[PDB]
Design a protein around this ligand. Sequence first.
Ligand SMILES: *[C@@H]1O[C@H](CO)[C@@H](O[C@@H]2O[C@H](CO)[C@@H](O[C@@H]3O[C@H](CO)[C@@H](O)[C@H](O)[C@@H]3O)[C@H](O)[C@H]2NC(C)=O)[C@H](O[C@@H]2O[C@@H](C)[C@@H](O)[C@@H](O)[C@@H]2O)[C@H]1NC(C)=O
Ligand SMILES: [Zn+2]
Length: 250
Amino acid sequence: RVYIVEVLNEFPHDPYAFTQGLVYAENDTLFESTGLYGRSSVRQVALQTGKVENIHKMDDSYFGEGLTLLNEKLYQVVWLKNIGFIYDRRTLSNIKNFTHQMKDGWGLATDGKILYGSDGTSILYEIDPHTFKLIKKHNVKYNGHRVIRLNELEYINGEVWANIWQTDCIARISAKDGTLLGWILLPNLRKKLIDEGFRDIDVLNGIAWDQENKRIFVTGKLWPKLFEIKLHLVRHRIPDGYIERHCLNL
Ligand SMILES: *[C@@H]1O[C@H](CO)[C@@H](O[C@@H]2O[C@H](CO)[C@@H](O[C@@H]3O[C@H](CO)[C@@H](O)[C@H](O)[C@@H]3O)[C@H](O)[C@H]2NC(C)=O)[C@H](O[C@@H]2O[C@@H](C)[C@@H](O)[C@@H](O)[C@@H]2O)[C@H]1NC(C)=O
Ligand SMILES: [Zn+2]
């Protein structure tokens, strides 16, 4: 299954937020982890305005990565480290750390019980948020190909959607066996933004799922907008290798 996305709503997103983690909490409150050394943060963000309502400015040495919210705690990984940070969502104080056993800290998501982690390999890791042991590694594959570059993750309805870094695709990955359930192609978002003059926006990255209202939000790094998107199943035939080219970059 391949989906395209329709933007239902655009919201401002801090165009300087190098989004590496995107969480929808509730009531139009997002949490975001931004990367870049010196700019990494965990943020509480108002969906409607993209206003940063609360920010934990990370140490300059960290490059904020995936973020998810689990049991009122934000779990964040960081780039080129196996350390994770846990923040109380209310104050964004780093209350606890963890380590994970991924190769890197890219994305995080949660099904509300466990953490899913990505490290940019094709492994979607299930991480126990108590022990921070790996529960399971899903080797995400599509058409025999590793779906590497699983980046920002979002658990949505039993699936973990993963931005695929440097694509405008999101992989829908079965939380059951890492099956690539579907590809979401979102080239329109970046393209339109670039058309609007946001020419140096970085990659699509950041998926947040609002289970309460059933809203998918996606944004990207340094994107000035965050998009509520609706997926539409592509019903037409997709060229062979299309996904491999666009989502797997070969
Ligand atoms: C999460 O993990 C980070 C990274 O290790 C912790 O921050 C680090 O905490 C170290 C232990 O306190 C800090 O090193 C100490 O610094 C002081 C001042 O120079 C020295 O006196 C002492 O001997 C240690 O060297 C280290 O600086 C700090 N690293 C960074 C990049 O901030 C973090 O600890 C928590 O946050 C930091 C910012 C401090 O407030 C710590 O006291 C606090 O524990 C770990 N978080 C948790 C909740 O464990
Ligand atoms: Zn997310």
